[PDB]
Amino acid sequence: MSVKELEDKVEELLSKNYHLENEVARLKKLVGER
Amino acid sequence: MSVKELEDKVEELLSKNYHLENEVARLKKLVGER
C-alpha cells in the first residue's frame, strides 16, 4: 500500500463521486421543479 | 503528504460516495427507473 496507490484511489473515488453528482442532477431534472 | 492524510481522504470520499449511491437509488425509484 504505497503513496502512489493511495493517490490513485483518491483520484478514482473523486471521479466516481462526480459521476454520481451528475446522476443526481439528471434524475432531479426528471422529477420536478425542485 | 503523509500516508495517513491519504487514507483519511479515501475514507472521507468513500463515505461521501455511499451517501450519493443512496440518494441516486432513491431518486430512481421516484422516477420509475429500475
Place this chain on the structure above:
Amino acid sequence: MSVKELEDKVEELLSKNYHLENEVARLKKLVGER
C-alpha cells in the same frame, strides 16, 4: 440486513485494513533497524 449496515461494515473493514497495512510498514522497518 439493510444497505446502511452493509455500507457501515465496508467502511469499518477498510479502516481496519489500512491500520493493518500501517502495522506491516512499521514492523518491516524494525526488522533491519540500525
Place this chain on the structure above:
Amino acid sequence: MSVKELEDKVEELLSKNYHLENEVARLKKLVGER
C-alpha cells in the same frame, strides 16, 4: 449500490483483512515483538 455488490465487497475486504493479519503475525515474530 446493489445488496449483492456490497456483500461481495465485505467478502473481498475480509479476505484481505485476514491475509494482512497473517502477515503482521509473521513479522511480529521475525522482529521478536510481542
